[PDB]
């Protein structure tokens, strides 16, 4: 019944601080040998160790954090807190807590929390603009460009979920403006373009926006093709 449960996601402005929590169940934080590691995972930076608090309340921090982090444990709730101050975009990551499982497992991290996403940005919460990618072997591709929203995620479905086969929704990319953008595409029979309605449904809960964009054939297309094999 050993478990670690972390607080929900955080979106915050640069220069601000964040306090995330880690509640342990099924065992005692004061059990000799036990401790709580904090680790973060970034998109291309892999995993990095951040800090550790031991059963005797001893605290250690990674020098790379430049003393911006503080660990507290209030032993009421069996909950450990990590506070990180003066945040910048480089602090944007998924933050995990994990139990250093004592001598028996040679202090391996045997149980992990579900992770907390921390996004550090100056962008305000904002719904996406949705633009059609008009359709153009008997197969045609069409889709929708979901542009300039914050934060993640958006959900995209086609024809209210009726169309799922051949659908690709791409990972969002952060633009230089601090806003996200993605595309969702689907391949369909070209003979269906005149008669089948194709609608992308874009949900963005953080801004409480729902958009349904019908994607229509172009009326003429002169796309050229060269080379290939």
């Amino acid at each position: 019944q050993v478990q670690l449960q972390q607080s929900g996601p955080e979106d915050v402005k640069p220069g601000a601080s964040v306090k995330i929590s880690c509640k342990a169940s099924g065992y005692s934080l004061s059990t000799s040998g036990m401790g709580v590691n904090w680790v973060k995972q970034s998109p291309g930076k892999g995993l990095e160790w951040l800090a550790h608090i031991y059963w005797d309340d001893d605290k250690r921090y990674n020098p790379s954090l430049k003393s911006r982090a503080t660990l507290t444990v209030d032993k009421s709730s069996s909950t450990v807190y990590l506070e990180l101050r003066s945040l910048t975009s480089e602090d944007s990551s998924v933050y995990y807590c994990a139990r250093r499982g004592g001598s028996s497992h040679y202090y391996a991290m045997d149980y992990w929390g579900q992770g907390t996403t921390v996004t550090v940005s100056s962008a305000s919460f904002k719904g996406p603009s949705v633009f059609p990618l008009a359709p153009s072997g008997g197969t045609a591709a069409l889709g929708c460009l979901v542009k300039d929203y914050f934060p993640e995620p958006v959900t995209v479905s086609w024809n209210s979920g009726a169309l799922t086969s051949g659908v690709h929704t791409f990972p969002a990319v952060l633009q230089s403006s601090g806003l996200y953008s993605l595309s969702s595409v689907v391949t369909v029979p070209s003979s269906s373009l005149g008669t089948q309605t194709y609608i992308c449904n874009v949900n963005h809960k953080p801004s409480n926006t729902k958009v349904d964009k019908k994607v229509e054939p172009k009326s003429c297309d002169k796309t050229h093709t060269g080379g290939g094999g």
């Binding site: 590691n37 995993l47 991290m109 990618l133 002169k222």
Partner: protein, 226 residues
């Protein structure tokens, strides 16, 4: 004091049933002063937290299948999977907790190997709606290819573009194990209307020669326009 873990390879395409081997080399000794070596292996599947596989170099954590084994001599350590099953796919991390700060390897992504497949390529001009707002996004789509490596080059009136595009790639698809990729070229409306021909050229192992998709702006026909 400051240990770098060099984990290789960064990605490992494997067939189901095959043996897989992942190596991890520390930049210096990770033998603790008490004589023990605190080397651990973790597996993180997509959408999930990392999970412990092996601790103290070679000990299997409870519930971990015996097809997983670890070994280590000096500063060289190895995770072995005797027969790869579908649930073993994901990213593997080595970790030393002997010296402070504890450090991780960069990770090894265990992927499903398959036959080469050429992408289907599509190009999309910007919508009228987007142009009204003063921005033009041109999108190049690469559908269902393998392996992951692909070259997408934007060309505008034969001029090679750089720095004004961004790519996004899907994970391996659950049914056919292929990838898909989108590339987006973004310009101001003013710059977009400065030029006639927009092209993306795709180079991939599955293609005998690079494929180009292009369009001529201001077009799709007519004599007298619009």
């Amino acid at each position: 004091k400051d240990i770098v873990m060099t984990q290789t390879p960064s990605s490992l395409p494997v067939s189901l049933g095959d043996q897989a081997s992942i190596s991890c080399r520390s930049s210096q000794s990770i033998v603790h002063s008490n004589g023990n070596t605190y080397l651990e292996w973790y597996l993180q599947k997509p959408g999930q937290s990392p999970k412990l596989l092996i601790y103290k170099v070679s000990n299997r954590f409870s519930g971990v299948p015996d097809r997983f084994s670890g070994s280590g001599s000096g500063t060289d350590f190895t995770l072995k999977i005797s027969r790869v099953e579908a649930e073993d796919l994901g990213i593997y991390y080595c970790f030393q907790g002997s010296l402070v700060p504890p450090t991780f390897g960069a990770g090894t992504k265990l992927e499903l190997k398959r036959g080469a497949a050429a992408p289907s390529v599509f190009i999309f001009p910007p919508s009228d709606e987007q142009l009204k707002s003063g921005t033009a996004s041109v999108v190049c789509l690469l559908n269902n290819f393998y392996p992951r490596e692909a070259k997408v080059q934007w060309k505008v009136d034969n001029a090679l573009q750089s720095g004004n595009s961004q790519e996004s790639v899907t994970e391996q698809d659950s049914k056919d194990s292929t990838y898909s990729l989108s590339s987006t070229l973004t310009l101001s409306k003013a710059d977009y209307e400065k030029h006639k021909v927009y092209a993306c050229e795709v180079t991939h192992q599955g293609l005998s020669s690079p494929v180009t998709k292009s369009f001529n702006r201001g077009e799709c026909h007519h004599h007298h326009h619009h």
